[PDB]
Structures are given as structure tokens and as C-alpha cells.
């Protein structure tokens, strides 16, 4: 079975730390027992458990940082968007929707009138 993620997202950092230290002792006391018997599948379902804890701690340490750079400019490069290199390049929707004021006057003065050839 192992630990579950929603049960770890309620606990604080101090409880997750001791939860991780107990499971890393569990790995040692199962890797000692692995050699004195022919098989031991149970070690799989303890090391996955450590993976789960090492997810949640990291997750709880990332989103907290996401709330201390909230709204302002210049958040770190692993917190801003990835998307691809070529979209993090050239013009955003504002900087490509910008048009000079003469051509704004010409867009307001003569727009494309919706017509129909019937009669």
C-alpha cells in the first residue's frame, strides 16, 4: 500500500520530514534483510513511498515560493512558463496587437463593411 498523497498534503513540513526519515530507516532495515532470504518484494512498496514523500515536500516547497513572487515581475526561471524556446521568444499578444496611431485612425475610419449582393 504505502503512504498516500492526499494524506500527506494535510501534514506539515515537520511531520513529512520525520515521515521521510522513518522510511529511509525502513529501506536500510529491508536492504539488510534482502540478502538473508531469497526474495523480498516489499522493498518496492517502501521506496515508492519515499518517492511520494519527496514529491509532496518539493511540491509544498514550490507553491509557497509561488506565493512569495506572486503578481510581481521577475519570478525564477523554473517557475515561469516553459512552453518551448520559440514561444518564449517573439512578440506577445499585446506587443503584436500594437499598431501605429495613423493606422488605428485608418482602421476606425474605413473598416471592412459587411455587404451582400442580392438586390
Amino acid at each position: 500500500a504505502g503512504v498516500k498523497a492526499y494524506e500527506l498534503r494535510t501534514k506539515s513540513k515537520e511531520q513529512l520530514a520525520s515521515q521521510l526519515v522513518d522510511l529511509k530507516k525502513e529501506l536500510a532495515e529491508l536492504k539488510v534483510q534482502k540478502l538473508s532470504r531469497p526474495s523480498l518484494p516489499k522493498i518496492k512498496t517502501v521506496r515508492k513511498s519515499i518517492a511520494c514523500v519527496l514529491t509532496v515536500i518539493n511540491e509544498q516547497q514550490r507553491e509557497a515560493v509561488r506565493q512569495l513572487y506572486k503578481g510581481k515581475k521577475y519570478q525564477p526561471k523554473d517557475l515561469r512558463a516553459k512552453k518551448t524556446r520559440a514561444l518564449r521568444r517573439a512578440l506577445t499578444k499585446f506587443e503584436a496587437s500594437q499598431v501605429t496611431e495613423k493606422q488605428r485612425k485608418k482602421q476606425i475610419a474605413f473598416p471592412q463593411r459587411k455587404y451582400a449582393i442580392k438586390a
Binding site: 485608418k106 475610419a109 474605413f110 473598416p111 471592412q112 463593411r113 459587411k114 455587404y115 451582400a116 449582393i117 442580392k118 438586390a119
Partner: protein
């Protein structure tokens, strides 16, 4: 090489001409593609016709000037003598060729009459709305042949 009784044949195949053979298997296929284009654009254009008007215009050099042909656009004189301005003609759906000049009277009168028959046979929706949907004719060149 040269042989029995046969014309001199000129065949320009001393190159690597098999690198550059382009066979058109996609022909009927691409036709379907273009027709879907003329479907898809004909959904976007808010029921305006696909093509703009082209003017009656008189062909070039001695072989071809017996015929008459759909030109590029109306001049800045034919448009002005139709009653409407140039940029407003662009927005109405009248294509305007700014650089051609009129030195003939029958072609000028035919283009001005063509603009009158166009401007009388359209209805232009208001800028605001209420949009009486008028069931587009897809072709404007076939309507005014």
C-alpha cells in the same frame, strides 16, 4: 546515332533530370482542397461574395485587343465618377487599381455603368447591427459578367 529517315529531335535531357521530375498525382486531390478553401472562406466572409469586382478593360497588343477582359481594378477616376471615394470603394468590395489611367471613353463609361449596376444591386449592413441576413451570392464576377 543519326539514322534512317527521321527528323532532328531536340530533347533537353542531358542533365540530372530525374532529380527534378514533378508528377501531379495530387491534382484531383488538390482540387478538393481548394474547394474546401472556397467553402471555408465562404463561411468566414460574413455573407459577402468571394471575389471583388473587376473592371471591363481592353486588352494589349495587336493579337488580343479585339477582345475585352476582366481587369484588375477601377481607376481613381472611375471610382470618383461613380460617386464614392477610393478607400470606401475598397471597403464596399470594389477593387481599385490606383495606377491605371483612362484614355478611352467607352471603357470609362462601361466601368462607371458597371459601378452603378453594382452599387444599385448590393445592400450594405449597418455598422451597429440588426443584420438582415441576405443569403450571399458566391460569385461577383458571374453576377456582373
Amino acid at each position: 546515332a543519326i539514322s534512317k529517315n527521321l527528323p532532328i529531335l531536340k530533347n533537353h535531357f542531358r542533365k540530372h533530370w530525374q532529380e527534378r521530375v514533378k508528377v501531379h498525382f495530387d491534382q484531383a486531390g488538390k482540387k478538393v482542397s481548394r474547394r474546401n478553401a472556397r467553402a471555408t472562406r465562404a463561411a468566414k466572409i460574413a455573407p459577402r461574395p468571394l471575389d471583388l469586382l473587376r473592371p471591363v478593360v481592353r486588352a494589349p497588343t495587336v493579337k488580343y485587343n479585339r477582345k475585352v477582359r476582366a481587369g484588375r481594378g477601377f481607376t481613381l477616376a472611375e471610382v470618383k465618377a461613380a460617386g464614392l471615394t477610393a478607400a470606401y470603394a475598397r471597403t464596399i468590395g470594389i477593387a481599385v487599381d490606383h495606377r491605371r489611367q483612362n484614355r478611352n471613353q467607352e471603357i470609362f463609361d462601361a466601368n462607371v455603368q458597371r459601378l452603378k449596376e453594382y452599387q444599385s444591386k448590393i445592400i450594405v449592413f449597418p455598422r451597429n447591427g440588426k443584420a438582415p441576413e441576405a443569403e450571399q451570392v458566391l460569385s461577383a464576377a458571374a453576377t456582373f459578367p
